[PDB]
């Protein structure tokens, strides 16, 4: 493990790799109480133990807390100059898209007030949509909140298009489908899981609550932590409960009648699962409060693998695109740790 300190007065809230855009996949953003900081990951000589070190590049000042953070495919590099596009959520309950050239915010769009969410925003994600001619036609941001609303915010050539959709319960996560921006997934706090075609009722709703194996009772309150697609065509769906209970469904052949596989993490997962970018069957989950991280294999290859235990709480974490490195933001730092097995 190598450890890189965040500035002394910087409290991290969120950590994400720029896996969404290959030109910028070595860019790391930390949303904190005064903005979003960008780091670069480089192969040093090091020892080929952790043959990867972190270089802090710069800090984008915003003046208020950043709670969720997503890079877009529009990110680019030039010589040098970084052209960034970031979706995030701020203390004023607004959802924003910030477009920068390095640390300087050259452009900013803000969706808030009554036109925005009418309660706390719980999650956000972003994808670039191109026309048939293949110019940038739209950038699309999806967000979910405690106002029982899902918001699709499309920024198009002739300007913004806003749409709201009602939910049976607070939205706790949302993510567009890989290799198919026409589809996306929305998570409700109550265990409902929506598959949605925004170009169009919405196509499908699964639910983890009634499926709990109950060989070991998952408890009275098993609030849904997370749902994410897996695979590079978005061939699968993985859902994780706060309790640690997880379930996986695949989407291809024949007729289907239950979720394909199911299990339970050793610990609660407040932050939810972070699926491996290269190995579908694998995902990571943290015991954020004691600072341990379990690695789970869906086809039970795993047998309780806990590669990571810190002596401190974990605020957030995410896979580097290479699949062997992990970046983890803790309350005062970010660690890059390399698991030798995944190399």
């Amino acid at each position: 493990s190598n450890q890189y300190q965040l500035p002394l007065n910087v409290r991290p809230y969120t950590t994400t790799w720029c896996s969404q855009s290959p030109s910028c996949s070595n860019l790391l953003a930390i949303g904190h109480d005064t903005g979003i900081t960008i780091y670069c990951a480089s192969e040093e000589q090091t020892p080929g133990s952790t043959g990867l070190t972190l270089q802090e590049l710069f800090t984008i000042q915003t003046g208020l807390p950043t709670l969720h953070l997503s890079f877009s495919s529009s990110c680019s590099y030039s010589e040098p100059v970084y052209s960034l596009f970031l979706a995030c959520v701020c203390q004023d309950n607004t959802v924003r898209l910030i477009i920068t050239k390095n640390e300087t915010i050259i452009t900013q769009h803000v969706l808030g007030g009554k036109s925005g969410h009418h309660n706390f925003v719980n999650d956000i994600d972003i994808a670039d949509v191109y026309s048939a001619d293949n110019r940038l036609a739209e950038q699309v941001i999806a967000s979910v909140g405690d106002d029982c609303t899902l918001i699709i915010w499309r920024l198009t050539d002739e300007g913004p298009i806003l749409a709201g959709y009602p939910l049976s319960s607070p939205g706790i996560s949302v993510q567009f489908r890989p290799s198919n921006p026409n589809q996306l997934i929305v998570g409700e706090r109550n265990g409902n899981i929506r598959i949605f075609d925004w170009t169009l009722p919405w196509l499908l709703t699964l639910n983890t609550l009634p499926l709990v194996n109950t060989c070991h009772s998952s408890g009275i309150a098993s609030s849904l932590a997370n749902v994410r697609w897996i695979g590079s065509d978005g061939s699968g769906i993985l859902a994780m409960c706060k309790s640690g209970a997880w379930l996986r469904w695949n989407l291809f052949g024949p007729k289907n009648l239950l979720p394909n596989v199911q299990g339970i993490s050793l610990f609660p997962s407040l932050l939810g699962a972070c699926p491996h970018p290269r190995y579908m069957d694998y995902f990571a989950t943290a015991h954020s409060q004691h600072g341990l991280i379990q690695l789970i294999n869906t086809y039970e290859k795993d047998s309780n693998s806990i590669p990571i235990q810190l002596g401190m709480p974990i605020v957030d974490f995410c896979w580097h695109q290479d699949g062997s490195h992990l970046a983890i933001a803790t309350e005062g730092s970010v660690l890059l740790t390399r698991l030798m097995g995944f190399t």
Partner: protein, 1022 residues
Amino acid sequence: MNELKHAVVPIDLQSFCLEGTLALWVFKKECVAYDAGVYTSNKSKGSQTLRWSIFQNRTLTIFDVSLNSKKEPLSKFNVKIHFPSNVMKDGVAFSFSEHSDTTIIYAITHARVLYYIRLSKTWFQLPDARLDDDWCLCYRPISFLNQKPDLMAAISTSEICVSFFNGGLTKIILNPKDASHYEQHDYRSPNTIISMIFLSTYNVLVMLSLDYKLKVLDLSTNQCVETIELSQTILPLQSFPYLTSDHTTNSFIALYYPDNSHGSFSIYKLNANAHSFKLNVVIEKGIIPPSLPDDEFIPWMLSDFQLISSEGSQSKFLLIIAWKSNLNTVIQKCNLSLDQDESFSCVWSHSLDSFSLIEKTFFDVPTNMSSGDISEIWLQHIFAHNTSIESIQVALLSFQNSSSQVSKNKLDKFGALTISELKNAVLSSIVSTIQIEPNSDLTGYDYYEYKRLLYNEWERFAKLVAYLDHFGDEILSINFDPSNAVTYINYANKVAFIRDPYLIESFDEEPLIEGYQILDLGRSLHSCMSFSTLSEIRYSLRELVQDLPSYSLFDTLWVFYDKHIYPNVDPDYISTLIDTLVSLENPMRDIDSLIQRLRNHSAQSPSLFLCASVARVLDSILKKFQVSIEGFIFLLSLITSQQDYELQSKFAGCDKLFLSLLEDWRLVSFLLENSANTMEALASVNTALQFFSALNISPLHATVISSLSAIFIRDDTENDLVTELVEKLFLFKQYNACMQLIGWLNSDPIAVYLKALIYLKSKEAVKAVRCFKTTSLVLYSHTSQFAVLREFQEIAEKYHHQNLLSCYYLHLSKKLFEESAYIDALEFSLLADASKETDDEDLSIAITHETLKTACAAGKFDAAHVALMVLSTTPLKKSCLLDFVNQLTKQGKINQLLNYSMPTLRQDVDNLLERKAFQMINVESQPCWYNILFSWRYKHQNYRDAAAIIYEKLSRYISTTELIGKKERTFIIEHYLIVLNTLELLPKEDTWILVQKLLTLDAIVAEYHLQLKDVAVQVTAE
């Protein structure tokens, strides 16, 4: 005629409010015959308690439904008494009498035996499985083989009589290890009795025989005291199974004869004037007419009747009568108000039991995500019904069979029991049955087939459900209770209650005098709307709870009608009503008044209270949602077009009372959602209860009146009942449901701090913290808030005053400790330290200290070190720095923490690090060696003395532990060298060891040399 209404009690909600269920000993075919209740019987006595018995094929059952006020008339459990054979194929077998704080029950099995069981009241209250007595004695008094019984009748705890088909009446006396017996000993026997009855002045019975003679019996003599001849020939031609031919009020008694097809019946309430010579008989009244709705050859059948008069004064008498034809039932009560009149003054009340299928249409549209997906909605329909129980279970594990048998699957049915998981099992069974066929486009699937598949699936299911309650829902008897004075009722496997119509009901029936037609016609208008329509409306109004007060209040008025144009709403209908509106004389001044006209200390309350009241008030609240929504829908369907003429102010206007009504709706629907010692009443599982317990003529009616009234009241309470609710209830349980519930509840200071604590309990720190932030406290020192103000108040008083703000922030710092999340505590404790406008010594001190803790829980940034120093420099609160800095080195970075001991003042550091030193020799640790080296560094900062001393102490310890020689010796070498060097570093001055110097050191050098020699010896041996 007047109407009556029913109140149904689901057996599963009983099982909810009854924690445990003990059992004592002493496909479609099996499903149908699974449950029934061959008969039903409920008793209760003069003294205190109440319970119902339920009958079953080869089984006997009993549970506690009493509405009392004792120490523990609330903690209850359901009892299953298994039998060798069923409780007879007939009405008989049943007796219940007590004695003293215990329940004695007499029974008769199917072929030829009696049963005597004595169960303790305590046994009912306790959760306990165990019983340490002989609760029962089975016995055979007379030869039943010879004479089969037909009627059993209780008289005393020791004694109980029996009636035989032959017509003889035996009496039976049992006693522990004892039994003595007495007699006056299609197949018929012209002295058989049809139905016996018992009332005591002391010991007198009343009988009606096959001979159709009215025999009156004295228990002492065991001979017939009186006889009257009632002469009807076409009467015994009519014979009824079970049925009670006679019943009773107090001293007097009544019975009646149907007179066959006429269905005339009667009331022959006999008055028994007991004289010293002999007990005298005086019957005083002829015949009572019937109602005439039962017809079409539909067999009316007298199930059971009970006569109860007002003991207050002979002004009225009331007879409750129950009729049934097939599964269907009719219930009515006749009230007779007489005093001198030989005339017949009888009010009559009528009742209807019917089936309305709310099924078929609500199925089609599940398109909106207001209540999304599909299945969840149907399950929520089955839960919305909330009145049918084990039928569901049966259907579920009948469908899961896949052409499997019953005998093993039946045990699997019994097995499930637990309710929360049941629902999960329901859905799991459902998805595993409906194959999803793909669209065959490109690895895609046809949801449009899943559509019909699912709809008609759950449709068929719930249709079999309704069929297992078009086979189960059945009535059999009625039994009145003196202690409670209530209109009890017995349906098979579904206890229920009788109640008078409420105003909302009478006006939901759609049956100086104006305005009412608007209400009924309007009700029709509301009923016109679709289901998805009301979905949109409910979601929208759900959005009108919190956010609504933010917009300008009175422009949204026309906007709602602008939302009303989307449904059908033919302009023909519109104008048709508009014409009515313009013809109104003066709407507002009448409406507001006449509707305003529509408008609490507790003993320890039981559970039937809470659940029966739950179901009934759920009914009342849903019909209410109906009536108010009606009101609104109209209110803006009127004031839509002709806007300028609306603002002409020719009409009185209505926006204000409009607002009031929306408040009302918020509360009511808040409740509509909510149904989805007294402290032990709160200790029972079901929801919405806590409310009824919070708000405790029949007792039920008044104590519900208290609730609904507390809902109506708006500005007088000056508090939202929702906030009140969640305030106390959060306290107990349901921390998770009050999440959506607090996300729903209207924004208030109270509501804010609760949002905080709840989003805290969920450990979603962030938003809880934003809640904490965006508000403060001026509410403090009010005490009206329950068991939560008191903390903040104690804290405010701890500063001998009432400081404006800093105190709150302090409280927030400690609360942040309770969350174990220490960083947000760093935040708030800051805010506390700062905003203090009072300049109290004590307060500032306390605040600075908690800040010290929060910082030390975080460690982190260096300043939390000079916070320490502030505290060390201020008074002798150095001990804080002790434990605190200890925790900091328990984070554990010496290279930094010692450099932080650097800006700390050397006096305070000398103190602190000497203490740490002492703790480190004490601790005997393995990383204590490090600790020792670091203290040494620190000593090098100082006079550089002690360090050496400590080295010696350490050396002593390492040695004392063990002796392996080997390496240990070389360690000691190293230690000798260390001391030597510390000494060379400290040549002149001199140091001192409690518990010397250069000389003892020459000695330790000697030890060294010794060990050297020893080693060399070892090397010459090898």
